[model samples]
Target: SMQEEDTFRELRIFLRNVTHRLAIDKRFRVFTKPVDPDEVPDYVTVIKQPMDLSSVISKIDLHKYLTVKDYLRDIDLICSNALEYNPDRDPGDRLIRHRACALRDTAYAIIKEELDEDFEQLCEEIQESR
Candidate 1:
C-alpha cells in the first residue's frame, strides 16, 4: 500500500534499464529468452541452471530480489550458465561463450558506474531489510 521505495529512486526502473541494455545487444540476443529444451533437446540436461535476461526482468517485476546483489547474481548466472553449457569445442558454443563474457563485463561495468557508489549503503540496507 505504501511506496516508500522509488517515489523518485525507482530501483525497479533502474534494473529494467540494466536488463534491456544487455538483452538487446547483438551478441546477447540469444540470451534474451530461455533456451527451449524442445529445441535444444540436450540443453536442460547439460545446464543445471538456466538463466536469461528476460527472466531477470520478470523477477524485477515479481519483486523477487531483496538487494541489488541479488540482481547482479542472476546476471552473473546467465553468463555463467551460457559458458558452462556452450563449451568452446564448436563454433556455436564459442560464439555464445564470447557473448557471455561480453554480457558479464557490461553488467559489472554498468553496476559499478551506476550502482557501485551505493553498495556501501546497500550492504546496510540488507541488514535493515531483515
Candidate 2:
C-alpha cells in the first residue's frame, strides 16, 4: 500500500491526461466510437478489432491500462483503423487518411514532448503491489 499503489495512481492520471489530449483534436471526432458494420459492411471484415477514443477513455476509467504503452497502443490503433479503412484513393479518402496521419503524428509528439518524464518515472519504479 505504498509505492506500487501510488505508482498505479500516477499511471491512471497519465492515461486520462493523454487520452484527453488525443480526443480534443477536431479531426479525431470520427474516431470516437465503434465502426458500425451496418453502415459499412466490410468494416467488420477489414478490421477485426476497432479502437476509439471513447473506448480508450472507458478502459482508462475502468483501470484496464496498467502500462503507458497500453494506452498509447490503443490510441495508435484508432488512427491505424482509420487509415486502413479509408485509403488515399479519392479526395475524400485522402482527406480522412490525412487526418488519421496527422492524428498519429500529433499523438506521438504529445507523448514525446509532455509524457516522457512521467513515463520515465513509471518505468523507474518497482511497482511493489499487494
Return the TM-score for candidate 2, rounded to 2 decimals. Answer: 0.82
Candidate 2, 39: how far from true, in Å? Answer: 2.4
C-alpha RMSD for every candidate: 2.6, 2.6
Please identify model 1 stretches exceeding 4 Å from their true place. Answer: 1-4, 7-9, 123-128
| lDDT of the candidates, in the order given | 0.79, 0.76
**Candidate achieving the largest TM-score:** 1
Error of 1 at 26 (Å): 1.3
User: What local lDDT score does residue 42 receive in model 2, on the 0 to 100 scale?
Assistant: 86
Judge candidate 1 at residue 98 and give its lDDT.
88
lDDT of 1 by residue, 1-130 (tens): 1343542135677788988898878888898999877889998888887888888988988977656677889988988898788776888888889888899899889888887556536644753666
**Cα deviation of 81, candidate 1, in Å:** 0.7
What lDDT does candidate 1 reach at residue 39? 88
Off by over 4 Å in 2: 124-130
